[PDB]
Design a protein around this ligand. Structure first.
Ligand SMILES: *[C@@H]1O[C@H](CO)[C@@H](O)[C@H](O)[C@H]1NC(C)=O
Ligand SMILES: *[C@@H]1O[C@H](CO)[C@@H](O)[C@H](O)[C@H]1NC(C)=O
Ligand SMILES: *[C@@H]1O[C@H](CO)[C@@H](O)[C@H](O)[C@H]1NC(C)=O
Ligand SMILES: [Ca+2]
Ligand SMILES: [Ca+2]
Ligand SMILES: [Ca+2]
Ligand SMILES: [Ca+2]
Ligand SMILES: [Ca+2]
Ligand SMILES: [Ca+2]
Ligand SMILES: [Ca+2]
Ligand SMILES: [Ca+2]
Ligand SMILES: [Ca+2]
Ligand SMILES: [Ca+2]
Ligand SMILES: [Ca+2]
Ligand SMILES: [Ca+2]
Ligand SMILES: [Ca+2]
Ligand SMILES: [Ca+2]
Ligand SMILES: [Ca+2]
Ligand SMILES: [Ca+2]
Lengths: 276, 48, 266, 276, 276
């Protein structure tokens, strides 16, 4: 009821635990499963959605609440990834040559970002603190940056000639650019086919989990070189058959949801902080 | 006799003026932008 | 917060990324200005009012109809300069209704399921290239009233080639829906309350906005301004000069994570 | 002033924390950055060194305090890594086929080694304890080993015939050799091309950090199979452009230096123990 | 240690003497003998190293503890001398012509130095105090000096014209330049085949002893004209046969080591501590 203020909450130890709410959340929540196209191709069964829905029902979920969203690959899925379910699970196939792209995708979807628009043609942009990044997504986003000194003259580049700009992104579907803080940069972005936004990492996004299918511990969802945390929402699975992968996902849905939580930014109690 | 210090620090704003005055007669030596970089190696075309 | 949301706030009566601004203006405004550097001038004029350099943003939209197709609200404060057209009144209202309020919308699969509106806060908001909403109310036996569930030509049309439309039907009644799902999408939306971080300035005309479906009320909130105009430069100058008053009418505490005009839940 | 003798130091659990010394250390210390030649090739700029120096200046490092050293590759760099700055950061590109070599390089520069000469063909050599290894470095190090029994006869090898020697390294720029302790070995090494030293791992080297660019966590700086310590001075980053890598290194230089410490063996305090 | 370096050590004047640690020192130490090529040539034996190792064993050293390093001559040895073992005995042949070179080598290896790089082409260098010298080492080190004045103009020399410089070293393998303190100098050095460093003499290096074979007391390890200290580590012997020299070294190894103090062995084998 008091939505604009952060009031302290006094809890008492020894307060009896409430019964398990897993059944109630399963009955009153929606699960989205994100898988690549090759998964469906290998499975080769036009009715596999119904089979998985029935298996989830055997596991508890009502047979109208599990959604299956298909994406071509990591690169395409990274353009405006919209996750609307109460609980989102993303099966991301591992490629040894796409480590940075997978890390960027996980950073984008495993964390909450507050993004403001960017007019590279109008303003010189600066990153204030470590939580600030430049997230750009599009069909082909190429970003070059020219740092400017206190006199607004470029460093190692000329503001007039974009050829001297330092290239940081080339033909990227998604890229999270981190430059030196407290320095103004002139930006050259292929805005005609990609959008760049100035974003802050508010914190974890608890309703999105990523299962890396058949790789190693390579995701780095933090730009700090000294930290490469492996949160509970990033799992790894060895695989040969996608049917086995989906059976493992179905059978351990309890644990997968346990690793996740309702989106803190969502729901009524988050009203008037950022959203709802 | 401590006043000298207190004055030396207090009146130090006038230092700026002195610098300006010393800059009045000083010659100006302005630099220009200098090319560096991956300078491509170009030579003559095959010549006979 | 959430664990202290349902707690009291006691106060005594005797006791005594920074903000970003977005300006949404029609393209005809920029055409009338005819200058290719006006954005920089307005940014500096705003900076006179205390907005840092890279804070104010200018977003262009072709017209009211096109802007209504899934509008996006980007900045902390969103001042929308809407040109008035006597022939587009409802549309303007619709946009305001979708922009000055917070909505909670769920997917609608019209082909498989009938739908009803539970209460006065429930509407059906549809957006896209062109919507043609045709409605067939049913009865307790699920037979259409003045319509045939099989024959869609007897359906009652409530929207035609709408880029945005908010449909309000009789509550407690199931309706079979024919929507041009190919070209536009419909959703069951609930109005939660005001969206305090968006203000709408009507350039020219008279007070015609109606952001409430109820016919008995047409409230003009502090976030609904109106100005007479002849030159767009004067419009932008008065927007810049009185930006303090415009922000006073707004609150920065309604900027969702995403720029959408409605929360979406599956 | 009481060098060469260890004395206990007594302190109280309520001494106030002193103010941050980060600014002073940046002002009065040097930083060396080691990168591969391909980094400069990809950057495709020649003023990039000055640009990075200015960016570091924005981070508090005085102009000229940051040094940029270049190496052709891991193999060439491993011949005799000589790190001289107060703080050493080594950017090491990942290659699976070079995994062990990378580890060896890290093992050589993330730890402090007390090395004595080895004169093969005149002395047999034992490895006394866990910390004793044989570090061979040169253009091409080929080490073959012949373990001897108590009577000085080889085990599975003939002292006279080198062809029977067990071959433990072939044409290596750097190799850390660990043999069974307490057993005398006859060594056949390409002395004309390589030099082998009997080294003791005293402890970690705190002023050298290695940032592994791309790949997974594969470094193994301890010979013991049961330990693979990823210390705080071993970092990993995903990459696609070297400019982003250098911007990450510059922006988070605070964290990188925090992970590191002054070389304990060096500096005046550790005088008449080993050095200075 | 470092937290107890600036703490007092109190001892009573009645603590009983401990037993002789000479045996334990020999057991846990390594000895390095540096001799010229002419010694090996005159000996003309392929097993003299093994004979000396066995004799040292008779004198208590373990088998693989004594090592022998050969240098062509004093001038050759003076280019980056490397001191490997815990105890370093250098048999230096006497030549009446190489007196200054003998003194320079002894000064370099009998003292601990703290050296820094000099970019002679960019900066004008001065010597701060009597402990500050310029040590140049290389294949051919030709150092010419141009002192300056308060106005930066040279005296007796022209900065533009190197031919007017005051040459102080020509065709040298090692040279220790001592110029007037507090005066800025501009230096011309053959950087292609020479490296010059600004060095400070920290103090004695007690683990390095020099035995002068033949001649008289000519070593002068102090730039100060008023003092020519003969330290305990500056031995001198008279010789006719190198075998007798080595026998004297072996027999009186007790006395030689007793004149040297352990714990002065740096982690690196260099003759100076390089700092950036
Ligand atoms: C909780 O579970 C217990 C034991 O199964 C049961 O008695 C009780 O009714 C359940 N519900 C509540 C609200 O305690
Ligand atoms: C003291 O700490 C503050 C806060 O980090 C810092 O700004 C300042 O430079 C430090 N040193 C002094 C002398 O105040
Ligand atoms: C020291 O020497 C004495 C006299 O021979 C002997 O008894 C003793 O065991 C030796 N060792 C120690 C540790 O005192
Ligand atoms: Ca990418
Ligand atoms: Ca450039
Ligand atoms: Ca940054
Ligand atoms: Ca990281
Ligand atoms: Ca409409
Ligand atoms: Ca009809
Ligand atoms: Ca209704
Ligand atoms: Ca109304
Ligand atoms: Ca190797
Ligand atoms: Ca064999
Ligand atoms: Ca061993
Ligand atoms: Ca190990
Ligand atoms: Ca000399
Ligand atoms: Ca002269
Ligand atoms: Ca001097
Ligand atoms: Ca002297």
């Amino acid at each position: 009821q008091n939505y604009g203020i952060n009031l302290p909450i006094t809890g008492s130890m020894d307060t009896a635990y409430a019964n398990s709410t897993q059944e109630e959340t399963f009955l009153t929540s929606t699960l989205c499963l994100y898988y690549p196209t090759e998964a469906a191709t290998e499975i080769n069964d036009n009715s596999w959605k119904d089979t998985l829905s029935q298996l989830f029902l055997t596991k508890g979920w009502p047979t109208g609440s599990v959604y299956f969203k298909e994406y071509t690959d990591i690169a395409s899925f990274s353009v405006d990834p919209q996750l609307y379910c109460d609980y989102n699970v993303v099966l991301m196939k591992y490629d040894a040559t796409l480590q940075l792209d997978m890390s960027e995708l996980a950073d984008l979807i495993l964390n909450e970002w507050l993004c403001n628009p960017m007019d590279i043609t109008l303003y010189y942009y600066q990153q204030t603190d470590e939580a600030n990044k430049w997230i750009s997504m599009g069909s082909s986003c190429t970003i070059k940056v020219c740092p400017l000194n206190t006199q607004t003259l470029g460093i190692g580049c000329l503001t007039t000639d974009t050829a001297t700009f330092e290239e940081v992104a080339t033909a990227e579907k998604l890229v999270i650019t981190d430059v030196v803080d407290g320095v103004n940069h002139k930006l050259d972005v292929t805005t005609a086919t990609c959008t760049i936004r100035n974003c802050k990492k508010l914190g974890p996004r608890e309703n999105v989990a990523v299962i890396q299918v058949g790789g190693s511990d390579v995701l780095d969802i933090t730009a700090d070189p000294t930290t490469a945390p492996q949160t509970e929402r990033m799992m790894r699975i060895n695989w040969k058959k996608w049917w086995q992968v989906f059976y493992t996902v179905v059978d351990y849905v309890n644990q997968i949801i346990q690793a996740m939580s309702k989106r803190s930014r969502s729901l009524n109690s988050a009203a008037f902080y950022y959203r709802i | 006799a401590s006043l000298i210090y207190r004055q030396l620090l207090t009146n130090s704003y006038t230092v700026d003026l002195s610098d300006e005055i010393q800059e009045i007669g000083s010659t100006k030596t302005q630099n220009v932008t200098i090319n560096l970089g991956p300078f491509a190696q170009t030579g003559y075309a095959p010549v006979n």
